[PDB]
Tab-separated table of C-alpha atoms in Angstrom:
chain	number	residue	atom	x	y	z
E	126	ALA	CA	19.525	-35.222	-20.947
E	127	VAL	CA	18.045	-31.871	-21.440
E	128	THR	CA	18.680	-28.007	-20.962
E	129	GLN	CA	16.955	-25.149	-21.421
E	130	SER	CA	18.228	-21.222	-21.581
E	131	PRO	CA	16.741	-19.201	-19.855
E	132	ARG	CA	15.598	-20.807	-17.377
E	133	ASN	CA	14.666	-17.473	-15.590
E	134	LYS	CA	12.986	-14.442	-17.435
E	135	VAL	CA	10.800	-11.121	-17.817
E	136	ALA	CA	10.124	-9.784	-20.551
E	137	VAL	CA	8.479	-6.859	-21.676
E	138	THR	CA	5.041	-6.890	-23.653
E	139	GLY	CA	5.324	-6.530	-26.964
E	140	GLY	CA	9.220	-8.026	-26.930
E	141	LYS	CA	10.391	-10.740	-29.015
E	142	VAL	CA	11.536	-13.927	-27.207
E	143	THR	CA	13.207	-16.976	-27.945
E	144	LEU	CA	13.430	-19.802	-25.647
E	145	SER	CA	15.828	-23.061	-26.607
E	146	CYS	CA	15.833	-26.373	-25.624
E	147	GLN	CA	19.086	-28.991	-26.497
E	148	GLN	CA	18.240	-32.625	-25.726
E	149	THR	CA	21.929	-34.905	-25.572
E	150	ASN	CA	19.595	-37.651	-26.685
E	151	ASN	CA	19.829	-37.802	-30.301
E	152	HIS	CA	15.985	-38.011	-30.361
E	153	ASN	CA	14.305	-37.106	-32.892
E	154	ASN	CA	11.272	-35.876	-31.727
E	155	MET	CA	11.081	-33.019	-29.594
E	156	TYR	CA	8.293	-30.642	-27.535
E	157	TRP	CA	7.510	-27.549	-26.023
E	158	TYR	CA	4.860	-27.328	-23.671
E	159	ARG	CA	3.383	-24.504	-20.985
E	160	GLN	CA	1.925	-25.647	-17.610
E	161	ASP	CA	-0.240	-22.586	-16.334
E	162	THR	CA	-1.475	-22.527	-12.523
E	163	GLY	CA	-4.620	-24.327	-12.163
E	164	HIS	CA	-4.121	-25.576	-16.004
E	165	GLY	CA	-2.934	-28.943	-17.270
E	166	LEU	CA	-0.021	-28.947	-18.839
E	167	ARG	CA	-0.293	-27.997	-23.014
E	168	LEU	CA	1.554	-28.414	-25.955
E	169	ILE	CA	2.494	-25.589	-27.636
E	170	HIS	CA	4.294	-27.069	-30.985
E	171	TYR	CA	6.409	-29.683	-32.081
E	172	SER	CA	8.744	-31.488	-34.294
E	173	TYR	CA	9.225	-34.930	-35.505
E	174	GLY	CA	12.856	-34.450	-37.276
E	175	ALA	CA	15.070	-31.621	-38.016
E	176	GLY	CA	14.505	-28.695	-39.799
E	177	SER	CA	9.886	-29.296	-39.147
E	178	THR	CA	7.872	-28.110	-36.596
E	179	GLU	CA	3.671	-29.202	-36.658
E	180	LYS	CA	1.194	-26.992	-34.841
E	181	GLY	CA	-0.508	-29.116	-31.254
E	182	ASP	CA	-2.921	-28.255	-29.319
E	183	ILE	CA	-2.382	-24.271	-28.776
E	184	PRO	CA	0.409	-22.617	-31.721
E	185	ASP	CA	-1.150	-18.890	-30.667
E	186	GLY	CA	1.098	-16.300	-31.521
E	187	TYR	CA	3.956	-18.957	-30.678
E	188	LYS	CA	7.159	-19.428	-33.711
E	189	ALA	CA	9.036	-23.081	-33.365
E	190	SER	CA	12.436	-23.921	-34.850
E	191	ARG	CA	13.827	-27.057	-35.115
E	192	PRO	CA	17.295	-26.228	-36.877
E	193	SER	CA	19.451	-29.694	-35.620
E	194	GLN	CA	18.615	-32.883	-34.420
E	195	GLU	CA	19.933	-30.998	-30.605
E	196	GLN	CA	17.968	-26.999	-30.571
E	197	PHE	CA	14.208	-26.947	-30.288
E	198	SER	CA	13.119	-23.364	-29.872
E	199	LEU	CA	10.238	-21.616	-29.203
E	200	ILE	CA	10.004	-17.505	-30.371
E	201	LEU	CA	7.935	-15.037	-29.094
E	202	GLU	CA	7.851	-12.570	-31.424
E	203	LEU	CA	5.222	-9.712	-29.415
E	204	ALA	CA	4.430	-11.227	-26.254
E	205	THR	CA	1.269	-10.543	-24.035
E	206	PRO	CA	1.087	-11.412	-20.340
E	207	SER	CA	-1.026	-13.878	-21.290
E	208	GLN	CA	2.685	-16.108	-21.893
E	209	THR	CA	3.467	-15.339	-18.846
E	210	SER	CA	4.359	-19.480	-17.973
E	211	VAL	CA	6.508	-22.275	-17.034
E	212	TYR	CA	7.522	-24.160	-20.084
E	213	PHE	CA	9.144	-27.104	-20.636
E	214	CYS	CA	10.389	-28.642	-22.934
E	215	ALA	CA	11.013	-32.388	-23.802
E	216	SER	CA	12.520	-35.057	-26.040
E	217	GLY	CA	11.880	-38.539	-26.809
E	218	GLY	CA	9.051	-40.602	-28.374
E	219	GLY	CA	5.634	-39.703	-29.443
E	220	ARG	CA	2.689	-37.368	-28.488
E	221	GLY	CA	1.229	-38.341	-25.606
E	222	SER	CA	3.178	-41.270	-25.048
E	223	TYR	CA	4.712	-39.543	-21.519
E	224	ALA	CA	6.679	-42.890	-20.840
E	225	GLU	CA	9.145	-41.435	-23.613
E	226	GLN	CA	9.883	-38.741	-23.131
E	227	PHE	CA	12.506	-36.660	-21.158
E	228	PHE	CA	10.966	-33.647	-19.283
E	229	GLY	CA	13.459	-30.378	-18.989
E	230	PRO	CA	14.176	-28.478	-15.956
E	231	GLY	CA	11.284	-25.357	-17.124
E	232	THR	CA	11.590	-21.419	-17.820
E	233	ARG	CA	10.507	-19.555	-15.604
E	234	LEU	CA	8.950	-16.566	-18.041
E	235	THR	CA	6.458	-13.382	-17.319
E	236	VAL	CA	5.217	-10.919	-19.117
E	237	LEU	CA	5.560	-7.467	-17.521
E	238	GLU	CA	4.402	-3.709	-18.699
E	239	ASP	CA	6.821	-2.171	-17.224
E	240	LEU	CA	10.189	-3.652	-16.163
E	241	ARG	CA	11.030	-0.949	-12.971
E	242	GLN	CA	7.623	-3.728	-11.541
E	243	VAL	CA	10.750	-5.719	-10.563
E	244	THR	CA	11.362	-5.746	-7.275
E	245	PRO	CA	13.308	-8.123	-4.245
E	246	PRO	CA	11.938	-9.434	-1.470
E	247	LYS	CA	11.845	-8.426	1.870
E	248	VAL	CA	13.041	-11.721	4.176
E	249	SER	CA	12.233	-12.038	8.168
E	250	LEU	CA	12.303	-14.711	10.815
E	251	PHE	CA	9.815	-15.408	13.301
E	252	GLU	CA	9.364	-18.186	15.795
E	253	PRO	CA	5.764	-19.524	15.815
E	254	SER	CA	3.902	-18.732	19.231
E	255	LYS	CA	2.377	-22.962	20.817
E	256	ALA	CA	0.246	-21.092	22.722
E	257	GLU	CA	-1.756	-20.329	20.044
E	258	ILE	CA	-3.040	-23.538	19.090
E	259	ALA	CA	-4.101	-26.661	21.265
E	260	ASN	CA	-1.936	-29.104	18.716
E	261	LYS	CA	1.447	-29.359	18.685
E	262	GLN	CA	4.216	-26.141	17.708
E	263	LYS	CA	3.363	-24.824	14.858
E	264	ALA	CA	7.660	-25.712	13.049
E	265	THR	CA	10.332	-24.316	15.287
E	266	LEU	CA	11.494	-21.107	12.524
E	267	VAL	CA	9.053	-19.376	10.405
E	268	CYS	CA	10.707	-16.845	6.991
E	269	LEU	CA	8.538	-14.393	5.539
E	270	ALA	CA	9.610	-13.966	1.513
E	271	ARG	CA	7.416	-10.748	0.892
E	272	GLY	CA	6.531	-7.605	-1.562
E	273	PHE	CA	8.684	-9.579	-4.005
E	274	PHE	CA	7.774	-9.109	-8.451
E	275	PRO	CA	7.920	-11.693	-10.357
E	276	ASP	CA	7.901	-15.302	-8.685
E	277	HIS	CA	10.706	-15.973	-9.628
E	278	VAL	CA	12.215	-17.037	-6.338
E	279	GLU	CA	13.582	-20.702	-5.002
E	280	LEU	CA	13.917	-20.562	-0.990
E	281	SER	CA	16.761	-23.058	1.071
E	282	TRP	CA	17.427	-23.028	4.520
E	283	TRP	CA	20.829	-24.035	5.212
E	284	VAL	CA	21.507	-24.403	9.801
E	285	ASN	CA	25.654	-24.397	10.831
E	286	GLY	CA	26.569	-23.416	6.945
E	287	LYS	CA	24.738	-26.280	5.412
E	288	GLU	CA	22.171	-26.385	3.304
E	289	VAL	CA	18.960	-28.727	5.151
E	290	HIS	CA	16.208	-30.138	3.008
E	291	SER	CA	15.069	-32.619	6.187
E	292	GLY	CA	12.780	-31.062	8.652
E	293	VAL	CA	11.796	-28.280	5.899
E	294	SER	CA	7.866	-27.063	4.655
E	295	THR	CA	7.662	-24.694	2.102
E	296	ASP	CA	4.682	-22.887	0.708
E	297	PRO	CA	4.154	-25.040	-3.187
E	298	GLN	CA	4.073	-21.967	-4.963
E	299	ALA	CA	4.285	-18.278	-3.762
E	300	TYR	CA	0.872	-16.162	-2.937
E	301	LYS	CA	-0.116	-12.775	-5.071
E	302	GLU	CA	-0.171	-11.340	-2.171
E	303	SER	CA	-1.482	-7.904	-4.222
E	304	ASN	CA	-1.307	-6.414	-8.203
E	305	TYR	CA	2.618	-6.814	-8.526
E	306	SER	CA	3.560	-8.385	-5.268
E	307	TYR	CA	4.276	-11.730	-3.676
E	308	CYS	CA	4.573	-13.750	-0.989
E	309	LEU	CA	6.220	-16.896	0.285
E	310	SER	CA	7.184	-18.901	3.655
E	311	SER	CA	8.059	-21.957	4.862
E	312	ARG	CA	8.632	-23.604	8.254
E	313	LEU	CA	11.484	-25.062	9.876
E	314	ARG	CA	11.763	-27.835	12.162
E	315	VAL	CA	14.554	-28.916	14.309
E	316	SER	CA	15.271	-30.315	17.852
E	317	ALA	CA	13.936	-27.521	20.804
E	318	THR	CA	16.969	-28.830	22.377
E	319	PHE	CA	19.066	-27.859	19.580
E	320	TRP	CA	17.005	-23.952	18.718
E	321	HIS	CA	18.456	-23.671	22.048
E	322	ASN	CA	21.998	-23.987	21.664
E	323	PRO	CA	23.375	-20.167	20.397
E	324	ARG	CA	26.371	-21.919	18.497
E	325	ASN	CA	23.391	-22.757	16.182
E	326	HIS	CA	22.567	-20.505	13.252
E	327	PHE	CA	20.159	-20.993	10.451
E	328	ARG	CA	19.991	-18.698	7.552
E	329	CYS	CA	17.183	-18.177	5.498
E	330	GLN	CA	18.261	-17.562	1.718
E	331	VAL	CA	15.972	-16.413	-1.574
E	332	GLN	CA	16.930	-17.383	-4.738
E	333	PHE	CA	16.262	-13.774	-6.679
E	334	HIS	CA	15.742	-14.394	-10.696
E	335	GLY	CA	15.754	-10.593	-12.192
E	336	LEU	CA	17.405	-8.723	-14.809
E	337	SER	CA	19.365	-10.945	-16.817
E	338	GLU	CA	22.663	-9.837	-18.478
E	339	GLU	CA	20.572	-8.497	-21.481
E	340	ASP	CA	17.996	-6.587	-20.034
E	341	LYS	CA	18.258	-3.093	-20.216
E	342	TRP	CA	17.290	-0.850	-17.399
E	343	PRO	CA	15.230	2.571	-18.053
E	344	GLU	CA	17.246	5.389	-16.385
E	345	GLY	CA	15.543	7.653	-14.769
E	346	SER	CA	16.885	5.372	-10.863
E	347	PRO	CA	19.523	3.317	-10.025
E	348	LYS	CA	19.063	-0.552	-11.342
E	349	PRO	CA	18.173	-3.100	-8.633
E	350	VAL	CA	21.313	-6.376	-9.455
E	351	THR	CA	20.224	-8.207	-6.056
E	352	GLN	CA	20.485	-11.440	-6.695
E	353	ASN	CA	20.672	-13.599	-3.253
E	354	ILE	CA	18.630	-12.506	0.356
E	355	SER	CA	19.038	-14.254	3.864
E	356	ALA	CA	18.032	-13.632	6.945
E	357	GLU	CA	19.416	-15.490	10.111
E	358	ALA	CA	19.477	-16.285	13.987
E	359	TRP	CA	22.066	-17.495	15.979
E	360	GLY	CA	20.337	-20.156	18.450
E	361	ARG	CA	18.234	-18.746	21.437
E	362	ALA	CA	19.575	-20.591	25.657
E	363	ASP	CA	17.946	-23.188	27.529
M	299	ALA	CA	38.710	-1.298	29.723
M	300	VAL	CA	34.822	0.757	30.141
M	301	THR	CA	32.499	-1.469	29.250
M	302	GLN	CA	27.814	-1.129	29.303
M	303	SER	CA	25.166	-4.030	28.717
M	304	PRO	CA	22.962	-3.700	27.054
M	305	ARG	CA	24.516	-2.689	24.300
M	306	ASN	CA	21.412	-2.243	22.631
M	307	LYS	CA	18.173	-2.579	24.433
M	308	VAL	CA	14.011	-1.531	23.491
M	309	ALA	CA	11.502	-0.862	26.577
M	310	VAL	CA	7.832	0.262	26.292
M	311	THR	CA	6.589	3.384	27.931
M	312	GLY	CA	6.315	3.212	31.359
M	313	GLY	CA	8.491	0.297	31.563
M	314	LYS	CA	12.015	0.087	34.238
M	315	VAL	CA	15.045	0.162	32.199
M	316	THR	CA	18.227	-0.627	34.188
M	317	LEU	CA	22.114	0.200	32.155
M	318	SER	CA	25.029	-0.346	33.804
M	319	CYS	CA	29.124	0.458	33.018
M	320	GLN	CA	31.465	-1.830	34.126
M	321	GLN	CA	35.010	0.417	34.672
M	322	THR	CA	38.234	-1.672	35.210
M	323	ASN	CA	40.182	1.269	35.933
M	324	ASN	CA	40.243	1.698	39.743
M	325	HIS	CA	39.332	4.531	39.135
M	326	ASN	CA	36.861	7.527	41.304
M	327	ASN	CA	34.713	8.962	39.079
M	328	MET	CA	32.320	7.471	37.221
M	329	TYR	CA	29.301	9.231	34.619
M	330	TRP	CA	26.464	8.488	33.016
M	331	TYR	CA	26.124	10.766	29.675
M	332	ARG	CA	23.245	10.827	26.468
M	333	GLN	CA	23.925	12.163	23.074
M	334	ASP	CA	20.797	13.590	21.449
M	335	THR	CA	20.957	13.714	17.635
M	336	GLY	CA	21.340	16.842	17.452
M	337	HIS	CA	21.762	18.248	21.051
M	338	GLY	CA	25.299	17.083	22.978
M	339	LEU	CA	26.420	14.964	25.289
M	340	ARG	CA	24.842	15.953	28.375
M	341	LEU	CA	26.234	14.522	31.641
M	342	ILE	CA	23.274	13.114	33.659
M	343	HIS	CA	24.975	12.249	36.778
M	344	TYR	CA	28.108	11.049	37.746
M	345	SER	CA	29.886	9.842	41.153
M	346	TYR	CA	32.892	10.016	43.304
M	347	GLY	CA	32.626	7.662	44.357
M	348	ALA	CA	31.975	3.907	45.398
M	349	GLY	CA	28.530	4.334	47.152
M	350	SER	CA	27.844	8.235	46.245
M	351	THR	CA	26.652	9.023	43.644
M	352	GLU	CA	25.667	12.885	42.150
M	353	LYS	CA	23.288	15.058	39.733
M	354	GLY	CA	24.378	16.445	36.845
M	355	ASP	CA	22.971	19.030	34.440
M	356	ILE	CA	19.834	16.685	33.795
M	357	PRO	CA	19.495	14.536	36.119
M	358	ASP	CA	15.561	14.182	35.839
M	359	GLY	CA	13.586	10.803	35.940
M	360	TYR	CA	16.767	9.325	36.516
M	361	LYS	CA	18.664	7.272	39.711
M	362	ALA	CA	21.788	6.312	39.686
M	363	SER	CA	23.821	4.005	42.237
M	364	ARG	CA	27.442	3.327	42.222
M	365	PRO	CA	27.683	0.334	44.385
M	366	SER	CA	31.338	-0.542	44.293
M	367	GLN	CA	34.563	1.169	42.659
M	368	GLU	CA	33.832	-0.693	39.469
M	369	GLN	CA	29.687	0.394	39.275
M	370	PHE	CA	27.745	2.760	37.583
M	371	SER	CA	24.731	2.050	37.192
M	372	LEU	CA	22.142	4.331	35.797
M	373	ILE	CA	18.359	3.644	35.999
M	374	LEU	CA	14.905	4.193	34.201
M	375	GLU	CA	12.164	3.893	36.951
M	376	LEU	CA	9.327	5.242	34.545
M	377	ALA	CA	10.870	5.024	30.561
M	378	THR	CA	9.981	7.567	28.312
M	379	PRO	CA	9.650	7.955	24.966
M	380	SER	CA	11.559	11.582	25.962
M	381	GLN	CA	14.477	8.796	27.087
M	382	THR	CA	15.200	7.514	23.341
M	383	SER	CA	18.892	8.246	23.447
M	384	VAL	CA	21.609	7.327	22.962
M	385	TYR	CA	24.256	6.178	26.884
M	386	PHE	CA	27.914	7.237	26.870
M	387	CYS	CA	29.612	6.205	30.114
M	388	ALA	CA	33.159	6.893	31.172
M	389	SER	CA	35.204	6.769	34.491
M	390	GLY	CA	38.631	8.589	34.945
M	391	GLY	CA	39.155	12.147	36.207
M	392	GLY	CA	37.047	15.521	36.881
M	393	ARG	CA	33.406	16.894	35.519
M	394	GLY	CA	34.299	18.459	32.085
M	395	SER	CA	38.116	17.509	32.261
M	396	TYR	CA	37.526	15.569	29.670
M	397	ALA	CA	41.241	14.970	28.596
M	398	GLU	CA	40.731	12.216	32.184
M	399	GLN	CA	37.690	10.702	30.382
M	400	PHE	CA	37.851	7.457	28.804
M	401	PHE	CA	34.334	6.349	27.688
M	402	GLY	CA	32.525	2.970	26.932
M	403	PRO	CA	31.549	2.113	23.839
M	404	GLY	CA	27.624	3.565	24.093
M	405	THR	CA	24.199	2.036	24.450
M	406	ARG	CA	21.011	2.721	22.043
M	407	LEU	CA	18.045	3.005	24.025
M	408	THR	CA	15.187	3.133	22.356
M	409	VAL	CA	11.521	3.673	24.250
M	410	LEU	CA	8.884	2.132	21.988
M	411	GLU	CA	4.732	3.269	22.187
M	412	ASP	CA	4.783	-0.746	21.530
M	413	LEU	CA	6.834	-3.972	21.611
M	414	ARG	CA	4.562	-4.955	17.485
M	415	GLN	CA	6.606	-1.755	16.667
M	416	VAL	CA	9.630	-3.870	15.575
M	417	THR	CA	9.920	-3.882	11.946
M	418	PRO	CA	13.756	-5.339	10.226
M	419	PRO	CA	15.211	-4.286	7.326
M	420	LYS	CA	14.673	-4.666	3.527
M	421	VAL	CA	18.233	-5.277	2.056
M	422	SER	CA	18.614	-4.423	-1.019
M	423	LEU	CA	21.588	-4.253	-4.269
M	424	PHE	CA	21.910	-1.165	-6.908
M	425	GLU	CA	23.869	-0.480	-9.369
M	426	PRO	CA	23.862	3.474	-9.994
M	427	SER	CA	23.492	5.265	-13.253
M	428	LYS	CA	26.484	7.301	-14.632
M	429	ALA	CA	24.813	8.357	-17.061
M	430	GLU	CA	22.507	10.487	-14.672
M	431	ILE	CA	25.658	12.982	-14.314
M	432	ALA	CA	28.048	14.805	-15.215
M	433	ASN	CA	30.546	14.147	-13.089
M	434	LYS	CA	32.056	10.778	-11.985
M	435	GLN	CA	30.463	7.177	-11.342
M	436	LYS	CA	28.034	7.390	-7.966
M	437	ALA	CA	30.175	4.021	-6.478
M	438	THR	CA	29.551	0.685	-7.695
M	439	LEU	CA	26.626	-0.467	-5.475
M	440	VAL	CA	24.688	1.378	-3.209
M	441	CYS	CA	23.190	-0.891	-1.163
M	442	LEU	CA	20.144	0.598	0.584
M	443	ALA	CA	18.133	-0.715	4.163
M	444	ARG	CA	14.720	0.218	4.298
M	445	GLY	CA	11.683	0.211	6.431
M	446	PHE	CA	12.724	-0.669	9.663
M	447	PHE	CA	12.346	0.359	12.937
M	448	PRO	CA	14.082	1.160	15.827
M	449	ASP	CA	17.220	2.142	14.124
M	450	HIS	CA	19.631	0.336	16.188
M	451	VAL	CA	21.623	-1.660	13.318
M	452	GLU	CA	25.379	-1.860	11.745
M	453	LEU	CA	25.458	-2.108	8.398
M	454	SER	CA	29.073	-3.795	6.785
M	455	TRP	CA	30.216	-5.128	3.306
M	456	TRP	CA	31.517	-7.901	2.802
M	457	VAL	CA	33.567	-9.278	-0.762
M	458	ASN	CA	34.933	-12.885	-1.678
M	459	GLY	CA	33.873	-13.376	2.235
M	460	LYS	CA	36.474	-10.785	4.282
M	461	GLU	CA	34.181	-7.457	6.066
M	462	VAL	CA	35.759	-4.606	4.213
M	463	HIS	CA	36.229	-0.857	4.968
M	464	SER	CA	38.206	0.884	2.481
M	465	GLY	CA	35.818	2.280	-0.393
M	466	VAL	CA	32.263	2.397	1.192
M	467	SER	CA	30.881	5.055	2.143
M	468	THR	CA	28.049	4.762	4.681
M	469	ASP	CA	25.117	7.123	5.500
M	470	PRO	CA	26.263	8.212	9.359
M	471	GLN	CA	22.993	8.087	10.707
M	472	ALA	CA	19.409	6.027	9.052
M	473	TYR	CA	17.135	8.631	7.985
M	474	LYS	CA	13.486	8.578	9.798
M	475	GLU	CA	11.425	8.103	6.296
M	476	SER	CA	8.224	7.865	8.363
M	477	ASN	CA	6.986	8.032	12.002
M	478	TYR	CA	7.847	4.327	12.779
M	479	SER	CA	10.598	3.883	9.556
M	480	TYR	CA	14.141	3.991	9.248
M	481	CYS	CA	16.407	4.269	6.287
M	482	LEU	CA	19.934	3.619	4.960
M	483	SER	CA	22.011	3.530	3.060
M	484	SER	CA	25.802	3.053	2.314
M	485	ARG	CA	27.955	3.071	-1.176
M	486	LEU	CA	30.890	0.947	-2.503
M	487	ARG	CA	33.181	1.708	-3.683
M	488	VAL	CA	35.503	-1.279	-6.984
M	489	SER	CA	37.236	-1.682	-10.049
M	490	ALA	CA	34.911	-1.661	-13.359
M	491	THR	CA	38.228	-4.739	-13.856
M	492	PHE	CA	37.014	-6.180	-10.048
M	493	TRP	CA	32.863	-5.656	-11.399
M	494	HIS	CA	33.072	-7.427	-14.235
M	495	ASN	CA	34.615	-10.514	-12.673
M	496	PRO	CA	31.243	-13.056	-11.761
M	497	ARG	CA	33.945	-14.702	-9.984
M	498	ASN	CA	33.900	-12.034	-7.450
M	499	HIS	CA	30.947	-11.982	-4.720
M	500	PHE	CA	29.936	-8.238	-2.784
M	501	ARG	CA	27.521	-8.642	-0.112
M	502	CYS	CA	25.988	-5.763	2.067
M	503	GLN	CA	25.435	-7.227	6.013
M	504	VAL	CA	23.241	-4.899	8.468
M	505	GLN	CA	23.045	-7.051	11.878
M	506	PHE	CA	19.618	-5.556	14.013
M	507	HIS	CA	19.101	-5.416	17.212
M	508	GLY	CA	15.271	-5.909	17.810
M	509	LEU	CA	13.906	-7.730	20.456
M	510	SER	CA	16.448	-8.827	23.152
M	511	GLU	CA	16.257	-12.286	25.676
M	512	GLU	CA	14.433	-10.661	28.553
M	513	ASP	CA	11.636	-8.848	26.275
M	514	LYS	CA	8.006	-10.054	26.099
M	515	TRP	CA	6.370	-10.319	22.744
M	516	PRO	CA	2.405	-9.714	23.550
M	517	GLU	CA	0.546	-13.093	21.876
M	518	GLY	CA	-1.079	-12.789	18.960
M	519	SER	CA	1.278	-12.617	16.049
M	520	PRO	CA	4.029	-14.808	16.064
M	521	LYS	CA	7.535	-13.380	17.745
M	522	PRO	CA	10.235	-11.473	14.725
M	523	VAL	CA	14.121	-12.724	15.700
M	524	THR	CA	15.573	-12.166	12.551
M	525	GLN	CA	19.526	-11.071	13.271
M	526	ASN	CA	21.331	-10.468	10.379
M	527	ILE	CA	20.205	-9.602	6.878
M	528	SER	CA	22.280	-9.834	3.873
M	529	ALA	CA	21.397	-9.144	-0.072
M	530	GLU	CA	23.979	-10.288	-2.645
M	531	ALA	CA	25.754	-10.471	-6.055
M	532	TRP	CA	27.990	-11.737	-8.635
M	533	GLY	CA	30.420	-9.992	-10.624
M	534	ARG	CA	29.145	-8.910	-13.990
M	535	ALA	CA	31.373	-10.066	-17.060
M	536	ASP	CA	33.380	-7.326	-19.101
């Protein structure tokens, strides 16, 4: 396995950030990459072995350290907005030989001007109108998450208390509705029959990752501590 | 018992509204009152018996009917914003002899200019700073419900899955934060010890009563169907 810590992080410009990657594959090579929405997966730094590191394609503003065979760290001495990205660690084989690499789950790192910019979402449920289009339905229910910042969210659906995976259609990425606000929508489809059973329960849940343990909230306001937001509705009669 | 239907209703100006009251006390007298935030409990119409009704203090714009011993209805032929209020039915004894009357649970009726004005709340959790005041704490957690309209909401707290009643301090009434927006806050208090147990789960839940079954959503937008909104957080380590 390949693991990353933290999985999500907000940093203020000029702060120091350390991203650690641990592997249990006893591989000699490790890699740190970033993936920018639009751009490809680019290599920052890599390592051929415990104790050594090499510059990849875009090393500027990053340092790397390989203190043991298992660990590969990425260090951002003075974080800049331009370092906002999704970071991926990998272990394995040769540089560019992707068939031989095993990737970590990724880490979302957002470098912001001020922590007070962190805002959890508003989550709501709506029923789409079939009246509006000549073609079929528009999904049973629509879940809308908006006004949140940064975009470190996970949306899931739950019917009668069990998470669902089928009949779900979530926006692939959050849309920047404004300067420091995002929007995310998802559609759920169930049998009209099912939706008209008032015994059925639907829940749209959004996991929000804001401040971490190690983040000091500037005094003046109460600290936002919200982690999970949910919007629920029961079926309608048939 | 004395029951009321509906318990919550939104109406558009000029629409017709019927509020029904049913009692199982076999009482001869029934009453319909309204309570305005600031004003007292005022009597609209009453009845001394099946088939008859009498004007109370403020009968204007309301009709009443007593079709049987058990039922007492209040009818608003052309609803006006001025009829936005909380309505109470009672059965019993004499007019003004409150010791002899049994009151229903009340009905929130809001007459609005347009149904598109119905918006569910945004619900969030914050930790207050003790640093800010010379006196003690400010409650463990603060729950904030805002941007909702009308004010037909219920807020409840749940710790580890069980609703709580102790250590809770909710705002007595929603505050009109703007023209067609309300705000509601509540504070929860638990032992610092408890809040620092990451095994503990806190949920602030707001029940939103918007559109009813019998409300036709003007086409053009997807209909808001959200009924319960919740903001959750787990304990923090000690």
